[PDB]
Paper text:
Of these systems, resurrected Precambrian β-lactamases have been thoroughly characterized in terms of their structure, function and stability. These putative ancestral proteins have been shown to be highly stable and able to efficiently degrade several antibiotics. We have shown that, when using resurrected Precambrian β-lactamases as scaffolds for protein engineering, a minimalist design approach based on this mechanism leads to levels of catalysis for the Kemp elimination reaction of up to approximately seven orders of magnitude above the rate of the uncatalysed reaction, as well as to significant ester hydrolysis activity.
Consequently, we used NMR relaxation determinations (see Methods section and Supplementary Methods) on the β-lactamase encoded by the most probabilistic sequence at the GNCA node (GNCAMP β-lactamase) to guide our design of a new active site. In the case of the wild-type enzymes, a clear increase can be seen in the flexibility of residues 252 through to the h11 helix upon moving from TEM-1 and BL to the GNCAMP to GNCA4 β-lactamases, which are the residues that are primarily involved in forming the cavity creating the de novo active site. The flexibility of this region appears indeed to follow the general activity trend described above.
Residue numbers in the entry: 28 to 58, 60 to 238, 240 to 252, 254 to 292
The structure:
Amino acid sequence: QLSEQLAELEKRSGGRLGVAVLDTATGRRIAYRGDERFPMCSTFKALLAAAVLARVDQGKERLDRRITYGKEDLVDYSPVTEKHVGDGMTVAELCEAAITLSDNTAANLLLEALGGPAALTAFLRSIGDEVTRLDRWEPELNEAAPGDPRDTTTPAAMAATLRTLLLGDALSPASRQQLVDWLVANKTGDKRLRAGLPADWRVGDKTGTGGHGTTNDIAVIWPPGRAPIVVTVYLTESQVDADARDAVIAEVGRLVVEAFHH
C-alpha cells in the first residue's frame, strides 16, 4: 500500500523518487526504487561522522583533538568553519557542524582526517555496505549527474547502513548515541521529513541537496511507544522547484506516519 502510494507521489515529484523504510520492530522493509542508485549529496556526512566515531572507538582519534586550517581550506557552504580559521575546531565540533548545519569545510577536514573519500568507502565496505561509494570531496560530489555512479548510494543500502551504525553495534554506545544526538539536533531538515511528522515523534535526520534537482533526507524516527524506523528518501532529476521537492519528502513523511499509525 505504502509502496503504491509512493509510486503516485513520484508522479507528482517531477523526478525519480527512491525510498526505503526499515522497521526495527520487525526487521521488515518497504522500498520504492530501493536498489536504484541515487546521488547522496550531503547525506554522506552522517556516514562520515560515523567513520570518525569508529576511529574514536578504536583509540585512533579523539573528539577533543583540535584541527587547525586556513582561509584557503574553506569551500562554500561553511557557516561554522568560516568563523574559526583563527582558533580551529575540535573533531567533535567539526562533526557537529557537518551534521547539524551541513558545513562543507567541516566535512572536508573530517575526510582529510580519515584518508579521503576512498577511506570512507572502505569503512563502509568493512561494515558490509557493498554499494555506497564516495569518490569526490566537497563541493564536486554534489554534481548528481544522471548515469554517474560516483558519490551514490541506494535507498535500501543507506537504510541498512544507518541501521547498523545508529541502532546496531558497529559503534560503541557512546558513539552511536552521540551520532543520533547530532542528527536529532539537525537544523537543516525542517521542511523535509520533519514537516511530515507529529510533534512527539522523535527524529534525527541528515539532508542532502545537489545538482539535477536533487533533494534528499535520511532519518531515524521514534514513533511513540515503539521501536525506531529508518527512513531514507532520495529524489533526483526533479523538475519541480526546491520548495516543492522539500514538500515531496515531507509527504513521504506523512505517508510513513499513516502506514505505521493509522
